[PDB]
Structures are given as C-alpha cells and as structure tokens.
C-alpha cells in the first residue's frame, strides 16, 4: 500500500472536493460521492484515482450527474471490506442518471455486505457480472429498476464465461475489460495473470505467486508491506485490517481525550486490539490504557437517544454491538425478506435487559426471536400505549419466540400483545405467559384467538391409524379415537389424501363427523373412512387431523397423526400400444410395439403368438385376364421381436399380449391381432423348360407349358407371345381356368407360315421368367 490512509469522506455539490483522494491508498471509512447536479461528462473525463485499492466500510453513489462509468475513477479498486454497512449493503449505486457501465474491473472481494444497484435508467453491463466470485451470499442482492430490466441492453462482450442458474453466458465489466476469473484452487486469495495461485494471506490481485509481500489487497491484517495472519506481539490489531504500535493507539486516545467538540472514541487496548471502548465486564486503567477485569458487575449500558430505537437493518443492529443493557425500547421492523437472523444474533446476542418495552412489527422475514440469545428481563419501565411490554402486530413468518425448554425470560411490568401472527402457535404464546410470570394480572389483548397460528399446524398430540386396507381402486382407513379433556369440545376430524410419487411429500380435504359416543369408553366405536377412484398400483400420502373449540379456559390443542405412503393393488394392464409387424425378409418378420398406456403395475413380460394363414378362396376361382379384374414366445424387457423360418408371400397372423405378472395366475391384457404377407421370391414364379406344341390340319396349334411348382402364393394367369417369320408380334392372355380347361392354350385361325412362341407366367406377386422359344408351322391352303 504505497499511499496515505484517509479517514473516510463525504463529497457533495462540487467535484473540486474529489481531489482530497489524490494520494489515498486506503480509505478508513465510507466513501460517499453524491448530489452533484451541475456536473457534465466533460468534467469527469480527465479525473482518475489509480492509487485507491481498498475501502473499509462501503461506497455510495447517489445522483452524480454526468458520470458515465467508474472504469476511470477507480481503475484499481480491489477490496471493499464492508466492516460498516449502509442498510446492510456495502455498495450502493442509486439514481445515477447518466451512468452506463460500472467498470470496477479490478474489484475482487466484498468481504461483508451485499450490493444494491437500483433506479439507474441508462445502466447496462449488469447481467454480465458473476457476483458469486465477489460476494459469498448473492441471494441478498438487489439489482432492479435499471435499463437492463426495461429494454434490451446491448451487452457487446469483448473473459472466461460462466454458468449461472443453468445458463451459460459471458462475463464482462465493459466493452474493453472483463472479469478476471481465477482457478478454483486459488480460492478467495486471487491468482496471478497466468493463473498461478497467490499466497493464502493475500486478497485479490497479486504480483508474483506464493509471495507474502507482493499482493495489492491484503487478507487478514497488513504490516510493513506484508500480510500477517495475526499481528506480531509488539503490535495490536486495529480496525480489523492493520496492526498499529502502542504509540499509535496511545496517540489516538490522547487526541480524543483533549476535546469532545463532535465526538470520537477513547481508543483502548484489549487482548491484542485497539478497541474504541472497554468491553462489558472490564474497566479502563490509568496509564498504559489496558482493559482490566472489574471488581464486580460491569454491564455495557447503551443509552438510546429519543428513548427508543427501531432496528430495520444490519446498521441499526451494529449500532448496538457489545451493549448488555438497553436503556430504552426496541422495535424490530425488518422488511424485505432477507433473513438477517445471523447478523441479529451477532449484534444483539449479548443484550441482557431492556428497560422499556419490546415490539416486533411487520417483520416479514423473521422466523424466531432466538437471536436474543441472552435477553433475560424486559423491565418495562416505559410501556407501549396500552400498558404492553411485549408487542407483536404482524409477523408473517414468526413460528417461534424462544426455546422455553432451556430459556428463561421474565417481565417485571406490563401485559402481552399478540395479533396477526399467522404462523405463531398459541401453545408457544401460552408457554410465554407461564414463563414470563404475567400470571397475577391479565392481558386484555392477550391473543386474537383466531389471527394467531391459523396458518400453522398447532396440533401436538399423536394419533395412530388402527389398520389400513388396500384394493385396486379403494382404500379403507381406521384410527384410534381421540378424546379431548372436555367431550363437548370435539368437532370431528379432517382427512387429506394426495398422489405421492415420492417418499418425502393440492390435498383434498375430507370432513368427518365426530365418532359416536358410548356410555362405556371401552365400547366406543372406532371412526374410519373409505376411498374410491384410486389408480391401481399407485402410491398416495394420507394423514388425519382433529379439530376442537379454542376455549381459552382449557386451551385444548387437538391432535394429529403421521404421514403414510400406501400403494393400490395392481390389475390387468391396457392393450399394448402400436402393434405393427413388418416382414424384414421373405422368411423373416419383425413385431414391434410399445408398453401399454396403463401398465396397472410393474410390466413383467409379453405374450407373442404367430401362425400361418391360408390364402383367400376367391383367388382360386376368379378370372383375371378379363378387363378390370386382377408356436409362441415370451418377450421380457424388450419392445421388439423377430421371427424366422417362414414361407415367402404367405399370409400370417400375429397375436401380442401384455402381462403384468408371470408366476401368480398370469394376468395379461386384451388380445391384439395383426395379419401380414411376407416378401416374395423372384425364382418362385419362374418357368422351366420350353413349350411343347402339337399341330393339327385345321390350322389349330396346341401349346403346353409347365406350371411353376412353388409360386409366390398362386399363379393367376399366363402370357403367350407368338410372332410369324418376318412379321410383328402378338400377345394373348391365358387364365388359370382357361389353362386348366384346355390343358394349355390352343391358337385357332393362324395364318400359314413359320411361328416362334414364348410363354410367361404371372403370379400374385409378379411375373416369372419366359419359356424357351418354340417353333411350329401352319399349313397353307
């Protein structure tokens, strides 16, 4: 850190005051630059502060007109420590009218706090920033109402991209600079330019790797150009970032002790620290300025001006850090749903007494008041209007006040007030009444009996299901009888059921009348319920719940049972889906389907059957030469099947079943049937040998040719082609009926001369090969 340390600044109106940061290297406080209305971009263009590397508290920018980016104002800012926050935020950019991009392209760590960038109407380059590499808790950020959320910011990124919430997008600060991502090994202590890890005692950037004296921002504590995990014995920790010698702390104490014009701290020494005040239970010495244990009880009383303090952020809580007795009243009014329980415990944990009252109003995020770890006594010397010492007006998420099993909290004066606390169960309030000792007086507004706990399960007692019965669509339930101390207070039971695909479960409310009363409780009849319309072999989540009158005299709390997962009984499955069969070969077929739409239980196997089918009878009787006429298998874990060893061009029938169980009385689906014809073979319909002929004196020629032995299904007709010597060619159709009638084909009226004839066969699939040429002669008259 080659520069002076500055005590933290506020800069308003004029940019002339911006020059006091000229030599600064660390700001020991907050940096606020705000309310510069007459500024223009021509003024900020030549203004740079490269020496600033660290801000201890926070950085706030508010209505600085004419500022377009911070890439020039703070070129080398590295770490914002965040010891003190601005409404639990360590960087606020609010209402910056002319800002375009942030540009803090060297910012590496914000050690404590969140970031709030809001109402910047021309600001882009926000979605291109991976905040998870800067803030450890990004869920508490607030980046809204900017140009990003309005139009389509043109983030023309120049830069290791990164995945956020399941989306892979690039990272960059400006159009010429982008985020400096470091290897995961170099975790939280930065990396070199080439990726080598720096020393574990360094923070952010570093010059050379693994060197404790060559890093810019320094983790833990800094001393004489070196980082130390803890300061050496001669030095003491100061401001949680640097080690100072005794002369420094003593000089600060002496400077503060001479005057009280505005207010400072009598800096004091403790166990290797230079703290503003001696902690609780210690007193300041005379000369060496060292906290020593007291001779008796020494609480750290924190006197609140105006008589009351409202806690709405981490800053307000930090204003009470270390105090043991609050001489005033506390209002807890935390909004926003940020769950500040950790910081509240850290800062308000040591509070032991509250002289006035305590009020928890509109604390939406608050879950429980356990962060008051040591609150022992609300004295109530100043009461809220209505003589209340404890107040709870609207707590959406308050589900607990204290753990009364091991916590003790008494109230000297005043009543209690509880209203509109949807998740605060009345049993907790009544336990608070018993513990706090308010018995002896009365609380007029003790509890709004119906506005407290009506969104939370306040049942405490346990109830057991007597037995459970299952069926394929119906389920019957019975459970033990519940009996409140007052019989008339019972109002029945409520049963809920919902589909439960998981084991870690919308619900359908079922109202049940109270069980029938009997003179002998041993003769009392067990209430029960039955259900209809349940999917077979399907799991559901069930439970029961009682209901009693909220009689404040007896304050009965009813009862509840457990949650159980019950599966229905399996039944027959539905038809197999998409049953198709394709003959992949002349002798092979493939059957394909999909599992049934309703398995109705675990699917075990499939039943497949196939067999041969005879050809149609009409094919053996119809004439086509006229115009205008022409063994089983069980399949397991598979949705396809192949069958081989078949006949070509033969009608077949295939039957497919779906069975959800094999051994215990087989349960299969409805029968699906498909019929198909296999592919034919070319050689099946081919003719063999020539045509035998006979010649008669009346110019009639008889032709006889061999019928194919194994045709593709059936031979339907034959084609006879004959041509005279030196003449054209003629064709003739011979049907199967004609072929059987004439035992071939007879040609009549042929002209005299020599003829050559060839004959081809036709089957159901196609035409066969031609016959060998045959020569015959016709007599001339």
């Amino acid at each position: 850190y080659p520069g002076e340390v500055c005590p933290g600044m506020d800069i308003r109106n004029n940019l002339t005051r911006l020059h006091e940061l000229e030599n600064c290297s660390v700001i020991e406080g907050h940096l606020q630059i705000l309310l510069m209305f007459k500024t223009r971009p021509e003024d900020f263009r030549d203004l740079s502060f490269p020496k600033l590397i660290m801000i201890t508290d926070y950085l706030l920018l508010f209505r600085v007109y004419g500022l377009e980016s911070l890439k020039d104002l703070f070129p080398n800012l590295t770490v914002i420590r965040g010891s003190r926050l601005f409404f639990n935020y360590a960087l606020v950019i609010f209402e910056m009218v002319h800002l375009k991009e942030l540009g803090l392209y060297n910012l590496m760590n914000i050690t404590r706090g969140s970031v709030r960038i809001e109402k910047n109407n021309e600001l882009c380059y926000l979605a291109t920033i991976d905040w998870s590499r800067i803030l450890d808790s990004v869920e508490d950020n607030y980046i809204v109402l900017n140009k990003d959320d309005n139009e389509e910011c043109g983030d023309i990124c120049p830069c290791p991209a990164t995945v956020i919430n399941g989306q892979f997008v690039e990272r960059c600060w400006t159009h010429s600079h982008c985020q400096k991502v470091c290897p995961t090994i170099c975790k939280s202590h930065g990396c070199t330019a080439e990726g080598l890890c720096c020393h574990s005692e360094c923070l952010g950037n570093c010059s050379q790797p693994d060197d404790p004296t060559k890093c810019v921002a320094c983790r833990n504590f800094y001393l004489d150009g070196r980082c130390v995990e803890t300061c050496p014995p001669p030095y003491y920790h100061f401001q949680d970032w640097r080690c100072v010698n005794f002369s420094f702390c003593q000089d600060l104490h002496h400077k503060c002790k001479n005057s009280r014009r505005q207010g400072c701290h009598q800096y004091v020494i403790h166990n290797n620290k230079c703290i503003p005040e001696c902690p609780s239970g210690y007193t300041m010495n005379s000369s060496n300025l060292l906290c020593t244990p007291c001779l008796g009880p020494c609480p750290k009383v924190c006197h609140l001006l105006e008589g009351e303090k409202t806690i709405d952020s981490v800053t307000s809580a930090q204003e009470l850090r270390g105090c043991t007795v609050i001489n005033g009243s506390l209002i807890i009014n935390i909004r926003g749903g940020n769950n500040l329980a950790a910081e509240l415990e850290a800062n308000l944990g040591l509070i032991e007494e509250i002289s006035g009252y305590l009020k928890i109003r509109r604390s939406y995020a608050l879950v429980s008041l356990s962060f008051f770890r040591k609150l022992r006594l609300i004295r109530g010397e100043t009461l809220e209007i209505g003589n209340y010492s404890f107040y709870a007006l609207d707590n959406q998420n308050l589900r607990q006040l204290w753990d009364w099993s091991k916590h003790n909290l008494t109230i000297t004066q005043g009543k209690l007030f509880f209203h509109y606390n949807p998740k605060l169960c009345l049993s907790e309030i009544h336990k608070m009444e018993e513990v706090s000792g308010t018995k002896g007086r009365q609380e007029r507004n003790d509890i709004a009996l119906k506005t407290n706990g009506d969104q939370a399960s306040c049942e405490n007692e346990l109830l057991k299901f007597s037995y459970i019965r299952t069926s394929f669509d119906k389920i019957l339930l019975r459970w033990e009888p519940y009996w409140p101390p007052d019989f008339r207070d019972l109002l029945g039971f409520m049963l809920f059921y919902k589909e439960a695909p998981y084991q870690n479960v919308s619900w359908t409310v079922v109202d049940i009348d109270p069980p029938l009363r009997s003179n002998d409780p041993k003769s009392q009849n067990h209430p029960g319920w039955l259900m209809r319309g349940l999917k077979p072999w399907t799991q559901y989540a069930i439970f029961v719940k009682t209901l009693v009158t909220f009689s404040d005299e007896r304050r009965t709390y009813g009862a509840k049972s457990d949650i159980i997962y019950v599966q229905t009984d399996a039944t027959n499955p539905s038809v197999p889906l998409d049953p198709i069969s394709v003959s992949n070969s002349s002798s092979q077929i493939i059957l394909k389907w999909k599992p049934p739409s309703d398995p109705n239980g675990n699917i075990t196997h499939y039943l497949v059957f196939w067999e041969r089918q005879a050809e149609d009878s009409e094919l053996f009787e119809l004439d086509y030469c006229l115009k205008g006429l022409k063994p089983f298998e069980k399949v397991v874990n598979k949705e396809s099947l192949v069958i081989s060893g078949l006949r070509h061009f033969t009608g077949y029938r295939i039957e497919l079943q779906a069975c959800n169980q094999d051994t215990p009385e087989e349960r299969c689906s409805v029968a699906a049937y498909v019929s198909a014809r296999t592919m034919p073979e070319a050689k099946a319909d081919d003719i063999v040998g020539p045509v035998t002929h006979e010649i008669f004196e009346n110019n009639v020629v008889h032709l006889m040719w061999q019928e194919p032995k194994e045709p593709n299904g059936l031979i339907v007709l034959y084609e006879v082609s004959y041509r005279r010597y030196g003449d054209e060619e003629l064709h003739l159709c011979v049907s199967r009926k004609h072929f059987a009638l004439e035992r071939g084909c007879r040609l009549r009226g042929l002209s005299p001369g020599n003829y050559s004839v060839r004959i081809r066969a036709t089957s159901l699939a196609g035409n066969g090969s031609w016959t060998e040429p045959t020569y015959f002669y016709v007599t001339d008259y």
Partner: peptide, 9 residues
Amino acid sequence: LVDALQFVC
C-alpha cells in the same frame, strides 16, 4: 355398492 358392502362386512 357391492364392493362397498364387502368393505362393510
């Protein structure tokens, strides 16, 4: 209600 009566019995 045949199954309902069976459940009853």
